[PDB]
Design a binder for this molecule. Structure first.
Ligand SMILES: Nc1ncnc2c1ncn2[C@@H]1O[C@H](CSCC[C@H](N)C(=O)O)[C@@H](O)[C@H]1O
Length: 193
């Protein structure tokens, strides 16, 4: 339909996949949190000075059920720059971005992301677990044969804080990054000190 947008926004040139293949791992409350994190990602994307092409893949099971029902009047099927895919094939390469340009983001890997680059596709785990499934996305990316990178933000997080961000905080941070290409500023915008 007619979403509210930042009419001055331009394409960052990146894709972000919310990897929502973890239905069976969450309880009902967490499926709720996830759906709301997805709607917040959309809000961040519409507001951002630079948008990404965001995809939810696979979009299935209780998450899909919740959109078909409690969130039916969000008009999700028609969202701007934000798409819902029936499987995870996009994570292995497609006609727009090939496999050598795909990275899986995870807090559990050593190698830091240096920058976000136009033409790349970044996968973010779509799961609300408060990091109870230790190294889940790291081991999965390894199995998929996709390189892993962590967000270069540990320099800005003190021990007492949460270094394993929510799905939506990661998206918000990634969008904010394009304003100045400054990780610290993007972090401080999303998680005020
Ligand atoms: N510091 C960080 N660096 C890179 N990715 C991060 C991150 N903090 C959160 N994320 C991303 O946000 C998603 C939600 S957090 C989910 C944690 C889950 N146990 C896991 O193994 O990943 C993660 O799947 C990861 O893609």
């Amino acid at each position: 339909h007619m979403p509210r947008i930042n009419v001055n926004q331009t394409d960052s040139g990146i894709e972000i996949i919310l990897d929502c293949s973890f239905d069976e791992l969450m309880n009902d409350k967490e499926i709720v949190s996830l759906s709301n994190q997805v709607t917040r990602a959309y809000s961040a994307n519409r507001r951002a000075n630079h948008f990404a092409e965001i995809k939810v893949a696979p979009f299935d099971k209780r998450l899909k059920q919740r959109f078909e029902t409690t969130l039916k009047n969000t008009n999700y099927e028609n969202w701007n720059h934000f798409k819902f895919l029936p499987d995870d094939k996009i994570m292995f390469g497609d006609e727009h971005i090939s496999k050598d340009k795909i990275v899986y983001l995870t807090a559990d890997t050593e190698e830091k992301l240096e920058k976000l680059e136009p033409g790349m596709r970044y996968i973010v785990g779509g799961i609300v677990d408060k990091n109870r499934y230790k190294e889940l996305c790291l081991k999965k990316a390894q199995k998929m044969g996709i390189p892993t990178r962590r967000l270069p933000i540990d320099e800005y997080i003190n021990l007492e804080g949460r270094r394993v961000l929510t799905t939506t905080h990661v998206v918000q941070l990634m969008l904010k990054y394009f304003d100045d290409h400054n990780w610290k500023n993007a972090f401080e915008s999303v998680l005020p000190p």
